[PDB]
Design a protein around this ligand. Sequence first.
Ligand SMILES: C[S@@H](CCCN)C[C@H]1O[C@@H](n2cnc3c(N)ncnc32)[C@H](O)[C@@H]1O
Ligand SMILES: C[S@@H](CCCN)C[C@H]1O[C@@H](n2cnc3c(N)ncnc32)[C@H](O)[C@@H]1O
Lengths: 285, 274
Amino acid sequence: AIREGWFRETCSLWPGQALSLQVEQLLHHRRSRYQDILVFRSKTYGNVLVLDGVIQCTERDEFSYQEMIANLPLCSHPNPRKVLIIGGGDGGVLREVVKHPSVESVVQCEIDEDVIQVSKKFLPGMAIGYSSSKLTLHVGDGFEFMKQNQDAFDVIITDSSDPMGPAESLFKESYYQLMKTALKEDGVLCCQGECQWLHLDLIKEMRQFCQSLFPVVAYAYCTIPTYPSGQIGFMLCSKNPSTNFQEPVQPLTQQQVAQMQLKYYNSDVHRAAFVLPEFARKALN
Amino acid sequence: IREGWFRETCSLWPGQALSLQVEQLLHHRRSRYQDILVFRSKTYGNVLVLDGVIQCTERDEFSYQEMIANLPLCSHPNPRKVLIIGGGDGGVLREVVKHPSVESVVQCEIDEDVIQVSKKFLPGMAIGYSSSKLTLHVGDGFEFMKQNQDAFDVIITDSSESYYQLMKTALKEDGVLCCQGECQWLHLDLIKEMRQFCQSLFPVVAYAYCTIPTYPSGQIGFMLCSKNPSTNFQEPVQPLTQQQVAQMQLKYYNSDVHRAAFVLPEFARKALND
Ligand SMILES: C[S@@H](CCCN)C[C@H]1O[C@@H](n2cnc3c(N)ncnc32)[C@H](O)[C@@H]1O
Ligand SMILES: C[S@@H](CCCN)C[C@H]1O[C@@H](n2cnc3c(N)ncnc32)[C@H](O)[C@@H]1O
């Protein structure tokens, strides 16, 4: 796992490539009921969370994914008040969601209470999210949880672990119809998508599936050095046929961006995040 | 390479590394100038490494090569005379010669061995050298730049402060340039300095980036400078139709990608503008 002062992330889902991060200190390494949980202090990326050997987050670059997965759907809804987060154990998405004055309630369904405990100790900049009075924390498999809800949420965000392990249930295509049912009449969702440089084929399949369920479906991406190939995508679906994901229905003023202490997201960034490389544009359109 | 993998370490991106799995070592010799290592990787095709730094992979080279040529070329109303500094692999050349307006491309490469290894092991890049527009020159592009005055519409540095004044002198009146820039996730402080430096020499300077998995942190930037105070780098003065993108066999660049490439994450927007 950690060899000669370095941790190397390998996975069959990104074959023949690897990020390694230099390790200053092992902080924590224990198996929960669900997954292997490894935390270390890296030399140059601050603290790093690893779940079943896949990097979940680093303190240095967390902000780009966290701000983007939160603000892409929230800024694409005229009045999001009830929000659902599936996953999100580190508290980082919550941190970003609760920043919006419109949001009154955020329900978070995390399967693994141990991820929460560990993040509260080792990811303080992320787990500050758990101090919000708007949070309802729920325990369980988000797949089965989604079934409990109908016409309940304005926004659903899936901040998922990886395909093996407990997140597999969130990768069943039926989950997307569960989310459609849980959403209000005009609700929107955002899920962790695929990297367009690694799994464009899966993005194309997922987009065509969602297009069969939802009037408006979009893919966006952000950059983040410590996800495979240095970026990741988001699936965005709306039940509102007038939603234009590419042009924020809630543009943020520079005052708001400053007040929200955003380090990645702003309204122009939002727009540009849907402009894909020609190969990806061609494949999806 | 160790245990079947090549690991790229460099003190300029400390504490981090890309490894690529090696299927077969193909070439490993020092030239007059640098260590040259070519391997067939498992999933990125052939990989050229100079002094331990990854230069290109066949899988993803198209992003950088397309962007470094089309950003300046599509920001000039009629680029006819082009200069490439570096470009050993032929790839930027490949992209430049696609433009009907381009009549001559001078390429100054210091290391003739890089050219020969690329012709053998990077054939999809080295097809650039079959262009009739090429004038191939040998030597240090720095001292080469001194020889030229009022000569080029566009200068691209495809690389492994004074140099920028030399480029300005070498450019025509309304000439433009594109140099490989820093990664905004790695050296934003250096981008800020270089921008302030260029802004002192040129009426119009801009920074754009592209994504490319096998450069450090998964992306790289470009410095764009123009001697024409009317140049708008962000909005291409030569937009491409879908038919043109198609005929040009572009896999990364198009006119929307050109525009978006200047839209920086907030931390960098703030640092370069505020
Ligand atoms: C750490 S967070 C990802 C890091 C970027 N914020 C991913 C979380 O998803 C949880 N997870 C994985 N599968 C599920 C299911 N099925 N349900 C709810 N939560 C899940 C897992 O325990 C991590 O906390
Ligand atoms: C391989 S290419 C970069 C890969 C993406 N096209 C970098 C080239 O720049 C050359 N190079 C390095 N220094 C110089 C100088 N000083 N002058 C000209 N060419 C140079 C080097 O030999 C490579 O061929």
